[PDB]
Symmetry: C3
């Protein structure tokens, strides 16, 4: 039937409270949401920057010290997931629609609308690619590495349930069960659901922009919700039996077609410029790492960071329980240093390669003289990928491949996240029998539809920033508790 801690009922109550906030106040929520979002990010952007930087340098320290000799699941455990397939399986479920919606719109947006004042067009493009490298580089995956390492260590080496409530066992003891770890699990479930709803909204907005650009359709008002309902239905079918699609084979096939799409853009585009720009921009991002990682825009105060950088940090921090729990169930016998390296460096380098392959080619097209992408981004940032594919051979085929790639990207993460929310709100792995995951996928669809009806992109950014604000202190306490637990486990072993 139904199993419930009191983390269930008040989570549903908070979700429906935001629902009637966004449906009984239809015109009064379009001014409450961006004002509250702007106040939260303008007062805590320094805290988001400090949290992300502390998390990343803690990942580097935990990989490159004596704490990296620990192996998850004890010294007798085996990896069992065939590391080349493990990289693909962690990349497919843990990423999307980030490298499709924002692979081109973000470097062009940083080109024409610069973060800090710049002199020429070449230096503006260099700054745009280095800020894209900041937003999709080591800082994006250091949070993922910390949460996956903490959840894997405290779910394997300590025999606790793989839950954010049970992660603070060395910091707080067995009194986490008495309503004081319930708030942590409430914030974890809310952050996972709101991040998945933000990804859902970005995916459907890019899909309807591509459908309007390709065939000249008119799906603004209503069948967008039908696209949501169809996608959640096929995702729950993949959750349902008959075939276990969306766990192992669909992730590998999706990564294969994503690599084929990226290689096709790399070959058909300016490959020499792409390779030289990849080397140059990776080196310039590593050289100016501390300068752009801790940049807070305090002197100019232009507010560029509040829509891009702090939104990205709150977005990656709000997807942290879902991807951290997924790679924590995945990595059963990895060395801790090897785990942090394989979650940090290799997916970070692959994401930087995707950013270079798309954004550097777009900036080469812009610097050649073609400024149609600038006007397309200034119209709406959702058509940037398809406008980029317009000046390519096989435009319609590549646009259809991109639409199918987005479709697989946000049909994999919803399937991998429904079980994560079910494990958070049920307290077990096999339990419950499979009806609540369909309800949680439908809740993600309902929240995405409601947020997109009561506001554009800014409603999703608002929701993800507000649920990621207390996760800064949650992840800092998580990092300190992981350091204490690793000290305890290393002092335990001979």
């Amino acid at each position: 039937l139904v199993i419930n801690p009191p983390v269930f009922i008040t989570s549903i109550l908070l979700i429906v409270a935001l629902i009637l906030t966004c449906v009984l106040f239809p015109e009064k929520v379009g001014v409450w949401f961006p004002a509250a979002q702007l106040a939260v990010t303008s007062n805590f952007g320094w805290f988001f920057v400090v949290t992300v930087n502390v998390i990343l340098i803690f990942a580097i320290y935990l990989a490159f010290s004596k704490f990296g000799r620990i192996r998850l699941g004890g010294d007798d455990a085996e990896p069992e997931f065939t590391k080349a397939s493990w990289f693909a399986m962690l990349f497919s479920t843990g990423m999307g629609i980030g490298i499709m919606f924002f692979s081109i719109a973000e470097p062009v947006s940083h080109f024409f609308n610069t973060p800090r004042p710049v002199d020429t067009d070449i230096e503006a493009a260099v700054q745009a690619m280095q800020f894209t490298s900041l937003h999709w580089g080591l800082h994006a995956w250091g949070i993922y590495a910390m949460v996956g390492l903490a959840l894997a260590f405290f779910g394997f080496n300590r025999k606790l349930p793989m839950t954010f409530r049970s992660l603070f066992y060395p910091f707080w003891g067995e009194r986490i069960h008495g309503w004081w770890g319930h708030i942590i699990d409430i914030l974890s479930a809310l952050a996972t659901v709101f991040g998945l709803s933000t990804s859902l909204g970005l995916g459907v907005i890019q899909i309807t922009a591509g459908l309007e650009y390709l065939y000249g359709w008119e799906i603004s008002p209503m069948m967008q919700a039908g696209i949501i309902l169809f996608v959640i239905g096929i995702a729950t079918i993949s959750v349902f039996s008959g075939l276990d699609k969306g766990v192992k084979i669909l992730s590998n096939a999706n990564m294969y077609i994503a690599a084929s799409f990226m290689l096709l853009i790399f070959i058909l585009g300016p490959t020499l410029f792409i390779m030289k720009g990849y080397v140059e921009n990776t080196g310039a991002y590593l050289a100016n790492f501390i300068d752009i990682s801790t940049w807070n825009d305090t002197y100019l105060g232009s507010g560029w960071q509040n829509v891009w950088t702090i939104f990205y940090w709150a977005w990656w921090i709000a997807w942290s329980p879902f991807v951290g729990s997924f790679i924590a169930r995945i990595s059963k016998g990895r060395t801790v240093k090897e785990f942090v390296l394989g979650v940090l460096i290799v997916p970070g380098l692959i994401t930087l390669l995707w950013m270079n392959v798309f954004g550097g080619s777009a900036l080469h097209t812009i610097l050649s003289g073609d400024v149609t992408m600038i006007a397309a981004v200034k119209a709406d940032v959702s058509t940037a990928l398809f406008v980029f594919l317009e000046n390519f051979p096989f435009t319609k085929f590549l646009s259809i491949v991109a639409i199918i790639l987005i479709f697989s990207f946000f049909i994999t993460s919803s399937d991998s996240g429904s079980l994560v929310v079910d494990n958070i709100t049920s307290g077990s792995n096999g339990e419950s029998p499979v009806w609540q995951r369909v309800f949680w996928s439908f809740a993600q669809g309902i929240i995405a539809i409601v947020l997109l009806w009561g506001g554009g992109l800014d409603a999703l950014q608002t929701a993800v920033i507000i649920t990621g604000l207390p996760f800064a202190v949650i992840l800092l306490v998580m990092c300190y508790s992981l350091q204490k637990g690793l000290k305890e486990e290393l002092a335990k072993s001979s």
Copy 2:
């Protein structure tokens, strides 16, 4: 009865030789002092930069290697200072009065009078804060860390008196007592006395400047010496028995009221700008660390470094034996890595926090449009803190708190410097009974009058620069001898 090494007589003779050189030919020494100072700094600024960078790089190496596993006073020794009080008590006889004089007058001066050319005001403020972070950051405290570490290791592990004569014990034999280590003690006593006279002259160039700004008094020149005589009398009272003031309670309550003053400026000022600028300026100072650490201004040759950067390095290197010997008295059972970390990083970060809290708020007021601090600094740099406190609520109360803060800041340092000088010129802890303490404090005050009458801030700069010039080779030989001693001691562990 008095005690008598030769260092006492042929250091007193040097002191009264400079007294005779300045009190006779009064107008003629104003052309010998800054010309000789300018020659020394223009010919050895590269050497000062090389010495400070080598000391800091050596501190980072000695903290993060196998030499950091050594513990002072043997392995069985336990520290007894309750470390949260140790951080404050090294900070009292330690940092100061440099924050209270140059926390505001230095970033405004680097704003309007830039070291290197800039293009706007935002970049000028960023470069001003990063040069301030260079001058009051890790390079400041690394010198203190090495002198304290060398004196503690060669006075606790080697069972020698903590004197600079015994600091070269592995590099030589027992030949230190035969007139060739006496010059080292001559330069150490002169460095302590001249640096404390520079700090006293700066603190008395201040305080009464705020008295003039508050009450419109006329004070100079005759009643200015009365402030010196009164604050030396209270310092010698703190030397005297009955109550042991200026040692522990006045080294903790002063830190408490200084932290309360910093928190009051942080709260009543632009706290969001202060926090964001603190994070951004600390990150930009760490990012551009090697670019501003080794900058010698060779191509421009403007001589900006000659009055700020090389003066600051000569001031730190001239205050080396004072706080180095006192911290070596302080830290008995600290681990070497823990010692270097807690003397370098945490006081450096706290000093950078004070720099950001005052200078970033001053730069925010300047960039808002208020350029009264610019004209105030262009008039005289003594009144910059009080002009900054003018537009704050409770101006008179904060200025009185600042004056009492400066008073306690150098009245602790004068007592600890009398301890250090009467330890160095004695070669013994207890002896002599207290009559040279009052004599050495009175000599410090007399040098303050003599230097302040024959020039303002400039003559103090000449005295500290010419006196700290041979301490560069003294500290380089000290670092090499410390490496030899650590390599000798670490091989002795069974």
Copy 3:
């Protein structure tokens, strides 16, 4: 008799095929050499940058890890060198003639013809010195450190002959003997022969330009051929018995007179500017290390890298069998970490000191107002050192000393290179006998004649870039094989 692997006769056939391509159809080779060179570097400059950066960071890692505890020649090898003779005989034979050619011609060229655009003139001079520091710094000697360390480890710790055929022993096993290490031996012999011919051509055009500027003579190509024939002749009667030059005597004397020449320029020039610019430019080169090490000039596409930095990386990579084999025979018992430090840091710092002493003094002369060096470099780059010595006391004596220094520099490398080519082309150490060292020196000279007659600088750059193109993959496979060999050897220690 003749030692005849097929490596020898098909290397001879390749060399005479280049002879037939050059002396027949001279306009065809003169129009096809810079086009093919430009195509190769424009398509693989990113690969040259990646290879050089990977080799350098691999040197830093493999010196600063547990692989550095291995000692060449076993644990009781006793290296038989004074650490001064090793450095001097390493520096004299393994460097040239860009210390005499590009010490002044390169920073002045980077001054007036900037790599990337700059605003003022001081920034142009700083950029020129930091790009000279990039070209003559750690990247220049990291390649030598890896090739010398791999050849020394695989020739001493494995009892294998010092040849690039045996350098891939843990990658293929015993398959290196049959026609598969043969091609690597062709590429190695062609690389060292073409690099030595490039150095011979640079030295003789500098000698010709210096004689023309000194005595006002005219130079025919047949007189230049006589200079080559005489210089190869003194080398061949240095190879012959009776007397040996050096084997270390000529190298030590050349190092002594080079140090005396550098000290004379340092003393008689602007010594304060030289020292301050040395400290500042070394710090700025270390600060902007990653930014200029991976800069590929992708956005501008100006082709500044085309003639300067990819030619430099192909030149240092093409001299790698020569210098690597020579340093490998030189050092018999050095610790691997100590070896990489003594080949990387100290010769890199000495080369940066020479670069600062000459180029910073030239830039001081230019920034003072004397712009005759700009017009001299714009006329011909081979007269820059002598034009610099024209505005210098003792012009004729210093020019004669510079000519003798060039003479020693390009007789010592040829004398050490005939032995290296002979050992590579025969497969055995010595016992050739001396009939083909003279022949290989004559072939080196003849290749220099035909490269100078069929083109100026561009033919030498073309030849060295073409033979250095497959050595990028050869050195990457070499680095991976060295890592596998060190991992195999370090596990063999009980």
